[PDB]
Design a binder for this molecule. Structure first.
Ligand SMILES: [Cl-]
Ligand SMILES: [Cl-]
Lengths: 417, 417, 417, 417
């Protein structure tokens, strides 16, 4: 057990940080995690979509090791470094942005979303922000307000910032059509905030915490046309979907519609804190000097890591692997859906952004608990906690991926057993 | 002209909104020495803006990070916890000036620490309002920008700020704002803006940082404490810049009898790696419900290892004592400068090695700053009017290199004369 | 023509006050209005539901005439009057409130809604307010935010107060079921604001400006149960539906569900400015002394009028007349619906709160213009301006009501002509 | 004991939140005489709180209202306009101190006039922020409560206030708040709270009313005007209490060279009937689009007739001159009281017949107020500390009855001695 440690944890730290695993990490590499006892876990969490290149990817660690011989922190706004500019250049070349792009780096995912909103507010001269129910954008007061889920993220913290409103995300399998979703945005214009007061509409192309809901292309196209008609900026939040998760570098790369601004974090850094925003030059250039920045933003350590993340994604063909592993997991879920009765209600996938929705959260906890007992680390998500989402490193060895898929099948088999 | 080529790339690839002070780029840094790409050496009196009290790449810090890189760099603590996080909370709880048992949690940025202290205070009190002070600086989120008591450049571009945040006058008796006047301005907020029983917290830097290194009078803290106790308001000390030995004790609040309910930390906590934290009264910290606090990069394993070694170094190397010794020597140099000069120096402010000199004019401050830069000395300015030079050299700076820095500083002032 | 007068109007007053009629009122009595030339108009507007007892009802004018011999203004909070207390007593006896009621009077409809929100905020200790799309509650910043229509009421005026959210009003004929409406309230709890932060849900039992939509009893029952479960107060806005319009004194009198607070204005005063709120004693008593009031609130003139309005409604059986006239108008609309093709899409009615929805606003303007040409004054309303709403005094002579109905039939007959 | 029976009915039927000052009830009032239900006579130095500059039931006013009652009492001006409204706008436009052509519109309450001046300013500037002053009083709506610079009793019960409203220090040189300090506090708001280009208006009473009858220094208006011109901010004069001859000219702003962009009016505008208005620069007033301004009771025909007769009476009866004569006589009495007494009078403030006396203590103010009440003289108090007696007698009060009132006042002060 870890129970002296958990006693220490409960004495020394607040209860408000929920902690899922009862065991403590001692070492991790690629898609394997060891506890203090040497028990091994196959990792289908990825630190919540942060390790698309795996724990301690060798080229990421080499890059960080080399940067530790140079410097770890100067504060970019005091003394800049070339690697930050180069990383911006590499992202500008790769991002789906219309016309010349520019990029800046911050530290956290919430900061990237919040600075995209700052940039959009200042470019448009407007305050309003429209997001979607079940969207997840951060734990800041502004990003909590944008977040479309009150429990547990914001119910403790009182009044939220004005001018943030939630529309319906298109989920046709749950009877929310593209029409209904567009109509809910229009109701916000008619009821809550005039279109010329809305600075940005912000959405995840694949909703992450909200349950791995993939946006229909038709919804993006009609949303783009609405934003173009009213001068509103369109923001794709790719904090969770970016860096090869969906089988292309950015989820937006699957669509013809382009966003004006795109946010990035998590596996950008391959396990080190960094985030960023890339977007149309003219939009990014709206804030005045001193208007953007941050102490830790663009950390030299995490910039060295991110350069190696891009290298690895392209050198190891990890977009392709994301599609290959995704399809294999989807086939296993369809067979579970057949082998079971009254359990699987939906299978959603784009690349290796894959989830299975179960009728009941109790069912999903049975599977998650069994997996944990048997050396497989699984995350749930969703409004009702009945979704298992799959976030294994895209570098996971195929034979170990199969072992995980087998344990998953075993966990489901215990439900009617 | 290679640095000309690099600054052209910077402007082409990144937004103008990130203001960058140095025209040269960092190639390597160690303790209090920074080298540019062409080999020129700079004495660091900036410390990455108070992030490097233990110096760039302190050997102990780097050794601890090197060892953690062989273990894991990221699990998401809320998914899989680690013992080093618990242990770091225990070490801060033991040291922090908190009445009764303390608890602590770690996030990533200084703004997150401030924003979570506000979340916790709102939760504990069931109130929404926040009082901060003019010239206070608390972060670049929408909520921490509203708390920050300087509109330009930080928040003028970004439109409406969240409700329930108000600014009082910080006590600066040298500038004719007495403790009485400052306390009276808090009471006017109660009388005019927001009832005391709707105020969750009063938040202040014990030494305002960006605001000009203004040291809070003890009488102001004790009167403020009595007002908070009387009204059930929490008192929050923001030590993101003042903490980890800068002022000659571990926390600036250690110089005072009065205790805060919550204390925020970041910057030199991590010795050059991204981490932040909040420590405070256990029953206040436990107010948010599980799930209510957290964050992907929070308490990064890398930065937690670094922070353990920062505390080790501060206590093993007697860096509180060094802060007092170096500050005393810098203050004597500033008083000599004040004598040798005519109409230049207006104030000298100091707690430990949180030291600043105020000049009549920002043109004067820039003349000294740029002389220093051309003679191998990196200096920062501050203050509502940009006429304050603040000193944030590593507390580990070799005494002979510090002396050289003070000689260059004196020569810079002499070019005024 | 009135065109020297209109020239004077455009020179001297702002354009933002829209004015419907091009002719000016010179005299009005019961349901007849004369212009300067002696042209007569049958009044189906009622000054927008203010004159359920008619222009210059003789007993209302006698009451005001008698009060003009006594006093017109003392400021109730300085010097009170017995008639205000008596009016509260009469409303307390008549209002559908559970347990003992209390009542206060203000001046405008928006004030009554805003004070109901003040009372609810203070009783519950919460800030949030939920309203419905197409709801109309006033032109104050708070009541504009509550109002579910951005054009033309709030699109000019920028950021709205935080904590106000819009759900879907149940309109089954337009495919918004009771289920869908309840589900939209629950989505607000899940996405925008936790239920323990919502002070009140505020709705018109019959939406007025939003197009005369009558609330299904089942929606009120389920909304009551939701509010009871979460401690939220339920507010019926009867500013437009009250004082016999719907064939009972209050629209809420048709339902078993009771609201906690009810707002009143318009025909409360029979043509003189007054408004009020009545509700559960315990709720009304929540604000502290000095917390409610107003210079003109409870004007002695308009209190004398309102006493005579209640007298007249009961003495002249105006609830019954409201049902009799309503049914007669509904029969005429059904015959128009038959006599026409592709014109009438809905007929809605509760008592003499009656409306006809046309396919097109252009159609409704053809009818309104013809009526005006032929001595009948008609109002439109609705999100799309395609609804004609009927607000004739309940005292209108039957023969003149028939003359109006005939002109209305003629106006419709010109559409396919 | 019939008045005991009535106060029991009051408490049973109405909320405690309406604070009522007099224990007796009004039966009749005329000019400056009020009679209770038992026949006792009171000299009115309250004027219904500055509503009766022309006295209770001024014969001209009542004649005008009596005539309008034979015509119509309510059409809803936005449905059917009336000429008397246009004519009233013309008469105010002619008289108001506005640079260039003016326009005016009428609403119902003082708070509505203030709230619509803010709506207009927000629209014209496209900005949201509002600066008011501590102790300013502007109404009881959520927006005007936020503007009001006194939290108790007015807004302490009602939770969060709308964003973008901040309070500066009003200049009171007798209390050690110089014009310099007041101007500096506005600039600190720009520096700390809200950028100048996000401020729509600065709003102030030229003579603060509830705040203690503080007369604005001319130098403060001219410096404030220069700051507004420099930043494109509008200057709003709130004359709800100061207007219609109280200060010895029609508007208090008529005493000053500096002109406001917008002026609000109510209270004695209507001579005892509910009406308010906003007058200002035509191009500012025309900013909102048609439909953007309005209101059911706005510009009530009854109150418009009364207001025409108020202006007639002010100019025909030379009530500006009477205001100066009566104020001068009251001030000489206060200075005699100040001499005959020891430690009681601390200030005498006066513009015209907006006159107040400040005492050391509110217990002192209540002793005088209650002596006066028991000897047939109705007096009001004011001020942050309730230690100010303010004088609002009708400007029509007979000189011999005014003299009697001043003799009772002197006797009341003597019971201190
Ligand atoms: Cl590349
Ligand atoms: Cl009765």
């Amino acid at each position: 057990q870890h129970s002296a440690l958990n006693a220490r944890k409960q004495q020394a730290t607040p209860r408000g940080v929920g902690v899922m695993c009862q065991w403590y990490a001692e070492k991790a590499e690629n898609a394997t995690i060891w506890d203090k006892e040497g028990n091994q876990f196959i990792d289908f969490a990825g630190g919540i979509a942060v390790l698309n290149t795996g724990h301690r990817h060798p080229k990421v660690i080499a890059a960080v090791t080399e940067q530790l011989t140079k410097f770890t922190h100067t504060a970019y706004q005091v003394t800049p470094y070339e690697s930050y500019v180069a990383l911006a250049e590499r992202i500008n070349e790769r991002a789906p942005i219309a016309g010349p792009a520019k990029a800046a780096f911050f530290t956290t995912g919430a900061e990237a979303v919040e600075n995209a909103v700052k940039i959009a507010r200042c470019y448009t001269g407007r305050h309003g922000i429209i997001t979607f129910g079940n969207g997840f954008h951060g734990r800041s007061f502004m990003t909590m307000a944008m977040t479309g889920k009150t429990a547990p993220y914001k119910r403790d913290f009182g009044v939220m910032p004005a001018g943030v409103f939630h529309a319906r995300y298109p989920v046709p399998a749950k009877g929310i059509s593209v029409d209904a979703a567009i109509e809910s945005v229009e109701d916000i214009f008619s009821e809550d905030i005039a279109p010329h007061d809305v600075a940005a509409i912000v959405l995840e192309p694949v909703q992450g915490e909200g349950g791995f809901n993939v946006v229909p292309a038709e919804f993006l196209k009609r949303l783009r046309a609405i934003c173009d008609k009213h001068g509103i900026l369109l923001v794709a939040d790719e904090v969770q979907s970016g860096f090869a998760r969906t089988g292309k570098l950015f989820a937006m790369n699957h669509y013809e519609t382009k966003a004006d601004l795109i946010t990035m974090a998590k596996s950008l850094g391959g396990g080190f804190p960094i985030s960023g925003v890339v977007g149309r030059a003219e939009v990014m250039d709206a804030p005045n000097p001193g208007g953007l920045g941050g102490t830790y933003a663009g950390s030299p350590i995490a910039v060295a890591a991110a350069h190696a993340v891009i290298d690895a994604i392209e050198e190891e063909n990890l977009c392709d692997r994301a599609n290959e592993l995704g399809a294999e997991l989807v086939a296993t879920l369809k067979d579970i859906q057949q082998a079971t009765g009254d359990v699987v209600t939906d299978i959603r996938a784009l690349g290796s952004m894959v989830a299975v929705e179960l009728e009941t959260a109790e069912q999903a906890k049975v599977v998650q608990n069994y997996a944990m007992e048997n050396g497989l680390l699984l995350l749930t998500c969703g409004k009702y906690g009945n979704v298992i989402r799959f976030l294994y490193p895209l570098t996971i060895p195929a034979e170990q991926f199969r072992q995980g898929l087998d344990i998953l099948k075993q966990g489901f088999a215990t439900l009617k057993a």
